[PDB]
Each structure stands twice: as structure tokens, then as C-alpha cells.
Amino acid sequence: QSVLTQPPSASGTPGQRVTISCSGSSSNIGENSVTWYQHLSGTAPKLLIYEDNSRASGVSDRFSASKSGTSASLAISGLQPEDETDYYCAAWDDSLDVAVFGTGTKVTVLGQPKANPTVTLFPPSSEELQANKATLVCLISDFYPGAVTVAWKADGSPVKAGVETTKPSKQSNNKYAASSYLSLTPEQWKSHRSYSCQVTHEGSTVEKTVAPTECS
Amino acid sequence: QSVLTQPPSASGTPGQRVTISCSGSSSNIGENSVTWYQHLSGTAPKLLIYEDNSRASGVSDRFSASKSGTSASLAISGLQPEDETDYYCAAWDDSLDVAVFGTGTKVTVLGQPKANPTVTLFPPSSEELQANKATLVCLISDFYPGAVTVAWKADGSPVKAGVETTKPSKQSNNKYAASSYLSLTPEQWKSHRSYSCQVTHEGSTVEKTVAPTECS
């Protein structure tokens, strides 16, 4: 039989230190070495700990683990917001002859700082103009919380056609990123001299403007 | 980490038959035993297969599995939507007693036709470089199912470091959009002959390239 029990979630304030428990049986944990993984959903679990308390290269000293009898624990000291993820444990099951995983624990980092987005406007590429297409991308990164507004303007006047904005999603650092793209004609691109992306986040607005070519 | 390669999506019409491959070295799969996991964005993985092919007692017979040295594969002979979950392979033992997970594969039952993505590479503007920065953007659009894997190189060398990739999202045409950006310094940029963006999508792999020509 089957699994290693983990509390569903954990909760901590930045700089604090949270403990993740893993319970098992004597066939698995009791007798064999434990392993802990961090999982972003869609990346592939990343090994943190091996052989009960060994750290994998790239793993920080903020994460330490141990095993007591039939129980194992992971301690995150210095809770950072990039730490908000899922943590799974594992150990070989002698009687079951398999690797038996933990139920998974998701750490919630309460009261994360507010991060006003960084805005970057990309004008139509060459590759794409000498291909007779024109797309502008307004990259919106490093924001928190994760809700923003986007508005496009052309020569000051509202661009109320051709825009596509992406729902924000988490970046590795636990901050959001999104994009807004406007498909125009190379015809349209040229005829204008100013294009602009305006992003509103938490009572603050930033606008970046782009103008038909500049440089070599 | 440095693990198992799995296509991002696998998908078919109801009652169809779907295959999910898993690729590695003659160190992992290629030598070890491979296990398969089933993961809904609900708490825990769930072993379908163990010791290459032996079905986890109680798993449905619509699940078959095999290995052949380098590769491995799990066939879902009975595609029904309760199968619409992520799937993971795992080899076992590079450093001792650890799981070596694959990238995960998302299975979707086609609700619309397959659509290869349109990839577009955008180099820095003159403007952001005049400001002493450089960010390339890789726009990924018009693709279905909703899942991709993006990789960046610099003179045919993987760029792991400093790339973020957005989670796919449903735009106004009913197809998905995503974007991945690579943050550099204005000289980290110009010290390389070019940068390319590579998107893998249910069979198809597209690679776009770009060179520093911005007021160069």
C-alpha cells in the first residue's frame, strides 16, 4: 500500500520558515532514504533533496530535510515568494516494490510585495515585414498581483481593433507576465508615426510609445 | 533539471488511441525501469505503470505500456475525457535512489482541429538598447492543442538561464497564444552571432533565428 501522507498546504510570511511533513510506513521511509521534489505544474518535478538530507546542485541552504523513524520533514527557512509551489516526498516501498510518493503540499506565501509591471513595446520585425506582416508586442512582466488592463492607441487615438491580450500567468520568480499583440498591415504600420501600449495596474498607469522605424 | 523528454500534448477524438512517448539516455530509461504517472491539478501523482509494463493493479486495461532501450511509451487505447490529465514518465537512479521525471504530456480530446503555431522572433528595439537593456520576445500563436515547449539557443547552445515562458491562453479565434522572453544585457546580445527560438508542438518543431543588427 500506496502513499505517504503530507498536509495539503502550508502557509508562511516572507522571511519566515515553514515545515513540510511526510509520514510513511517502515517498508518505505522507515527503512529507505527519502527524496523531496518541488513541482511547478508543467515543468517536471525538480529534485531538492536526496538521500534524506542531501541537496542537489542548484538547491539553496534554505531547504533542509530529515527523517525520524517513519517520518520525514522539509524545512524552508527564509520563505521567499519563489517558494510558493508544490512539494512531494518519496521513498521506495520494500513490500510494494515501487517508489511511493507523498500526497503533495502547496506552500502559500502570504502577503507578497506589490510589483508594478515593466512594459516593453517591440515594433514589427524585419523578418516579418519582408514577409509582409506586422505585429507589435507589448510585453508586460514582473507584476504582482496578477490582474492588469491594457489599451492601445495609435497617433493618440484608440486602437479598438486587432488586439489580443494573454491572461497573466506566473513566472519562475512568482511574479506574473503577459503580452498584448496588435496585428496591423505593413501599410498601417508605416502610415503612423506613434503606437502605444498603456498598462494599468493597482492605481498606476504606464504607457510606452513606438514609432515607425528607428535605427539600423 | 536534465531529464526525460515528452511531447507537450498528445490528443485524439473520443475512443481514439493515443501514444505518449518518453525519451532518454542509456543511463536512465535506457537501462533503468520506467514508471508512468497520472496527475490531475489535484493533489498527487498516481502510478499507472511500474517496472516498464506492469500495470498498477486496478488501472484500466485501456492503459498499456512498453520500453525499448532509449525510449518508452504509454498508449491510451480508449480515449475518453476522464483521461484529460497530465502524464509523467520517470526513470530511477542517476544519483542514488531518486526519480528522474519526464517533462509531462497533456492529453486533450480534440474539440477543434490541430493547428501548428506561428512563431515570431522579436529582437530588442533601438530604444530599449539606448536605455541599456535587451529582451527578445518569442510570440507563439494560433496553435491547438494548448501546450508547447519553447527552448532558446545562442550559437546552437541551449539557453536555460533567464528565460520565462507564459502559460498558453485562449485568444479570440479559439486557438492558443503564449510568449517566452529572454533577458540580456546590450552586449550579452551583440557578443553572439544569433539567437533562435524553438517551439515543439505535437509533432512539429519550429525554430526561428535572429541576429543583432539594431544600429549595429
Please enumerate in sequence order all residues whose Cβ is within 8 A of that of A139, keeping only pairs 6 or more positions apart, or say none.
A119, A120, A121, A122, A177, A179, B135, B137, B179, B181
In angstroms, the CA B200 to CA A46 distance is: 21
Amino acid, single-letter form, for residue B3:
V
In angstroms, the CA A170 to CA A186 distance is: 33
Residue B175 CA, chain-centre distance (Å), reads 18
In angstroms, the CA A140 to CA B116 distance is: 25
DSSP codes of every residue in chain A = ---BB--SEEEE-TT-EEEEEEE--IIIIITSPEEEEEE-TTT--EEEEETTTEEPTT--TTEEEEEETTEEEEEEES--GGG-SEEEEEEEETTTTEEEEB--EEEEE-SPPPBPPEEEEEPPPSTTTTTT-EEEEEEEEEEBSS--EEEEEETTEE--SSEEEPPPEE-TTS-EEEEEEEEE-HHHHHH-S-EEEEEEETTEEEEEEE-S----
Contacts of A215 in chain B (CB under 8 A): 126, 214-215
Method for this entry:
X-ray
Please enumerate in sequence order all residues whose Cβ is within 8 A of that of B165, keeping only pairs 6 or more positions apart, or say none.
B150, B178, B179, B180
Contacts of B181 in chain A (CB under 8 A): 139, 141, 177
Q: If you measure CA to CA, which chain A residue comes closest to B103? A: A44
Do residues A103 and A149 both lie within one domain?
no
Q: Which of A111, A127, A159 is the last residue of a domain?
A: A111
Over its C-alpha atoms, chain B yields an Rg (Å, rounded) of 20
Nearest residue to B82 via CA among B108, B47, B50, B114: B108
Question: Do the Cβ atoms of A41 and B41 come within 8 Å?
Answer: yes
* HSE-CB for B156 with a 13 A CA cutoff: 0
Q: At residue A92, what are phi and psi to the nearest 5 degrees?
A: -65, 140
Chain A interface disruption, residue of B179, B207, B215, most A CBs within 10 A: B179
Do residues B101 and B162 both lie within one domain?
no
Amino acid, single-letter form, for residue A178:
A
**In Å, how far is A14's CA from the nearest CA of chain B?**
23
Chain B interface disruption, residue of A49, A53, A98, most B CBs within 10 A: A98
Q: At residue B33, what are phi and psi to the nearest 5 degrees?
A: -105, 145
Question: Do the Cβ atoms of B43 and A171 come within 8 Å?
Answer: no
Q: Which residue has the cell 533533496?
A: A49
Nearest residue to B83 via CA among B147, B38, B53: B38
Is the CA virtual torsion A89, A94, A96, A99 positive or negative?
A: positive
Resolution in A: 2.2
β-strand partners of A162: none
Q: At residue A25, what are phi and psi to the nearest 5 degrees?
A: -120, 180
Question: Do the Cβ atoms of A127 and B210 come within 8 Å?
Answer: yes
Nearest residue to A164 via CA among B172, B83, B95: B172
In angstroms, the CA B177 to CA B142 distance is: 6
In angstroms, the CA A92 to CA B8 distance is: 28
Residue B190 CA, chain-centre distance (Å), reads 29
Q: Which of A111, A131, A166 is the last residue of a domain?
A: A111
Task: Give how many domains chain A has, as a whole number.
Answer: 2
Contact between residue B66 and residue B53 where contact means Cβ atoms under 8 Å apart: yes
Residues in chain B, overall count: 216
Query: Helix/strand/coil (H, E, C) string of chain B?
Result: CCCEECCCEEEECCCCEEEEEEECCCCCCCCCCCEEEEECCCCCCCEEEECCCEECCCCCCCEEEEECCCEEEEEEECCCHHHCCEEEEEEECCCCCCEEEECCEEEEECCCCCECCEEEEECCCHHHHHCCCEEEEEEEEEEECCCCEEEEEECCCEECCCEEECCCEECCCCCEEEEEEEEECHHHHHCCCCEEEEEEECCEEEEEEECCCCCC
Do residues A76 and A154 both lie within one domain?
no
* HSE-CB for B43 with a 13 A CA cutoff: 15
Please enumerate in sequence order all residues whose Cβ is within 8 A of that of B161, keeping only pairs 6 or more positions apart, or say none.
none
Do residues B153 and B190 both lie within one domain?
yes
β-strand partners of A178: A140
* HSE-CB for B33 with a 13 A CA cutoff: 12
β-strand partners of A108: A11
Contacts of A214 in chain B (CB under 8 A): 125-127
Contact between residue B162 and residue B182 where contact means Cβ atoms under 8 Å apart: yes
Region of B187 on the Ramachandran plot (φ > 0 left; ψ -120 to 50 alpha; else beta): alpha
Contact between residue B119 and residue B208 where contact means Cβ atoms under 8 Å apart: yes
What's the Cα-to-Cα distance from B184 to each of B126, B134, B162, B208, rounded to whole Å? 14, 5, 8, 18
Nearest residue to B97 via CA among A19, A196, A90: A90
Question: Do the Cβ atoms of A35 and B1 come within 8 Å?
Answer: no
Do residues A76 and A138 both lie within one domain?
no
In angstroms, the CA A105 to CA A38 distance is: 9
The CATH number that applies at residue A48 is: 2.60.40.10
Do residues A90 and A118 both lie within one domain?
no
Please enumerate in sequence order all residues whose Cβ is within 8 A of that of B149, keeping only pairs 6 or more positions apart, or say none.
B7, B8, B103, B199, B200, B201
Do residues B140 and B82 both lie within one domain?
no
* HSE-CB for B199 with a 13 A CA cutoff: 28
Do residues B183 and B105 both lie within one domain?
no
**In Å, how far is B17's CA from the nearest CA of chain A?**
23
* HSE-CB for B95 with a 13 A CA cutoff: 19
Q: Which of A88, A111, A134 is the last residue of a domain?
A: A111
Do residues B77 and B150 both lie within one domain?
no
Contacts of B177 in chain A (CB under 8 A): 164, 166, 179, 181
Do residues A154 and A197 both lie within one domain?
yes
Question: Do the Cβ atoms of B213 and A126 come within 8 Å?
Answer: yes
Contacts of B106 in chain A (CB under 8 A): 42
Q: Which domain holds residue A121?
A: 112-212
Give per-residue burial for A165-199: e unless 16+ CB within 10 Å, then b: bbebbbbeebbbbbbbbbebeeebbeeeeebbbbb
In angstroms, the CA A99 to CA B98 distance is: 9
Contacts of A47 in chain B (CB under 8 A): 1, 95, 98-99
Contacts of A106 in chain B (CB under 8 A): 43
Do residues B174 and B204 both lie within one domain?
yes
Collect contacts of B205-213 with beta carbons under 8 A, ≥24 apart.
B206/B116, B206/B117, B206/B119, B207/B119, B208/A127, B208/B119, B208/B120, B208/B121, B208/B138, B209/B121, B210/A125, B210/A127, B210/B121, B210/B122, B210/B123, B210/B136, B211/B123, B212/B123, B213/A126, B213/A216, B213/B123
Closest CB to A139 among B137, B169, B213: B137
Find the angle CA(B38)-CA(B54)-CA(B28) to the nearest 5 degrees. 75
Do residues A7 and A103 both lie within one domain?
yes
In angstroms, the CA B89 to CA B36 distance is: 4
Query: What's the grid cell of residue A79?
Result: 520563505
Is the CA virtual torsion B89, A36, B158, B162 positive or negative?
A: positive
Q: What is the dihedral of CA B12, B16, B17, B20, to 10 degrees?
A: 20
Size of interface A-B (CB pairs under 8 A): 141
Q: Which residue has the cell 492605481?
A: A203
In angstroms, the CA B82 to CA B40 distance is: 10
Contacts of B167 in chain A (CB under 8 A): 42, 169-170
Query: What's the grid cell of residue A162?
Result: 486587432
Query: Helix/strand/coil (H, E, C) string of A129-182?
Result: CCCCCEEEEEEEEEEECCCCEEEEEECCEECCCCEEECCCEECCCCCEEEEEEE
Question: Do the Cβ atoms of B122 and A120 come within 8 Å?
Answer: no
Give per-residue burial for B138-154: e unless 16+ CB within 10 Å, then b: bbbbebbbbbbbbbbbb
Question: Do the Cβ atoms of B135 and A139 come within 8 Å?
Answer: yes
Count of C-beta atoms within a 10 Å radius of residue B49 = 25
